[PDB]
Design a protein around this ligand. Structure first.
Ligand SMILES: [Cl-]
Ligand SMILES: [Mg+2]
Ligand SMILES: [Mg+2]
Ligand SMILES: [Mg+2]
Ligand SMILES: [Mg+2]
Lengths: 251, 251
């Protein structure tokens, strides 16, 4: 319930990796007691781009009872008070019919272009997106370096993205070219801000967000700068703890 | 590539309705002849706020091969020498996540206010905009006259537009209250100047624009006054004919 909190009208959301935990490690004991004390005053929750099976590694096994809200895959999978609230996936949203046209088009497109180096894992299917690589994610470190230079000279990914946009003008997808070898395809607005529709029915006066990659291009950018949140940029769990202690007057 | 024309560095863009054609009707054969003569000298194109399905009625069946540039819906759909250059829609630009929040808010807002007369078609979804009417576009002629007086006394549309701006401050939308019953909602800058980005790669030294509603509030105002264009205000195709013949030395 939301009955035993000094401010049942304030929610604090946390990016997981690098905000509640170190850069690639598990959560500290002081952070857990800090959250436990924070939960006494306000509603707390987390949001991360990975699934619940990756966040248990970072946050612990008893995660559904540690946070009032648990947002996995940017909120595609959501829990409230430890009960499932909603589940959504890319394939459920787009449907198999459209996804089969999309895959067949991409497979044909890749078979027709001229590449000097091909490897494998040209399409990686994920729960909230697909990733498309003309050379393939199985390229070695050096093959990825080489492809990046080839792609800068011949604009392979850019041209493929434009071909996809014109072939599927009504699919509602966003395309993001990033890194050395690939681009992301996902429904517009399926970033960390996705999770906020899940808390709307509580009509909080304030929604705080803490994240370590709020810069341009980071996966906290959209939700930090969202009008529904008060953003707090951090660089470590230590910053998170320092800010929490003063802001919510923890003892 | 327009290497055949006498001066491929000069583009001439035309508004359609009232500039190339009469008030609301077909294009004359003399205008067609004038354009083809003009086509041999300069790069020509048109820009109109309607979709292809209307301009094919105003300009003719092979409109696609009658102009070097065909800009429908202010250029959201673009053709270059009969080649598809770009395609864009309101829903593709905003995305379903944001559009669903916008619609849900409008439906709830309308359900909460007190109106004497309600009908239907409160939200009209269009390819370049939505139109929102508190009484609804299914209102009869007299019901629209009655609502205009009610709205002028109570400022229903004005209050609703301000509520929309406060709720969605980062949606990048323009609101236009006009007529008796409704207001338009469209992405900022989606006027006839939107098409100018589609010709930016050729770097024309002169882009003429002809328009019959270049006055304040008319749909030609922005592109006529744009610093990239040389504007020519007209009142009928006969004016357009007269100016083209002397300026480009036709006949
Ligand atoms: Cl593959
Ligand atoms: Mg992080
Ligand atoms: Mg913010
Ligand atoms: Mg006109
Ligand atoms: Mg001008």
């Amino acid at each position: 319930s939301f009955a035993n909190k000094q401010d049942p009208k304030t929610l604090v959301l946390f990016d997981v990796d690098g905000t509640l935990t170190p850069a690639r490690l598990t959560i500290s004991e002081e952070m857990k007691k800090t959250l436990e004390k924070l939960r006494e005053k306000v509603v707390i929750g987390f949001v991360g781009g990975s699934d619940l099976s990756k966040q248990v590694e970072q946050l612990g096994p008893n995660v559904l009872n540690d946070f009032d809200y648990c947002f996995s895959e940017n909120g595609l999978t959501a829990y409230k008070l430890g009960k499932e609230l909603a589940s959504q996936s890319f394939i459920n949203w787009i449907g198999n019919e459209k996804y089969n046209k999309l895959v067949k088009f991409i497979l044909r497109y890749l078979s027709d272009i001229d590449l000097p180096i091909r490897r494998g894992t040209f399409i990686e299917f994920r729960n909230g997106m697909i990733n498309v690589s003309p050379i393939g994610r199985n390229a070695s470190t050096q093959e990825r370096n080489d492809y990046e230079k080839f792609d800068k000279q011949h604009h392979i990914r850019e041209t493929m993205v434009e071909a996809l946009k014109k072939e599927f003008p009504d699919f509602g997808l966003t395309y993001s070219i990033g890194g050395q070898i690939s681009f992301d395809v996902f429904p517009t607005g399926w970033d960390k801000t996705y999770c906020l529709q899940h808390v709307e029915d509580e009509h909080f006066e304030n929604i705080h967000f803490f994240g370590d990659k709020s810069y341009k291009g980071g996966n906290d950018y959209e939700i930090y700068n969202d009008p529904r949140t008060i953003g707090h940029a951090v660089n470590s769990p230590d910053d998170t703890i320092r800010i929490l202690n003063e802001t919510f007057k923890l003892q």
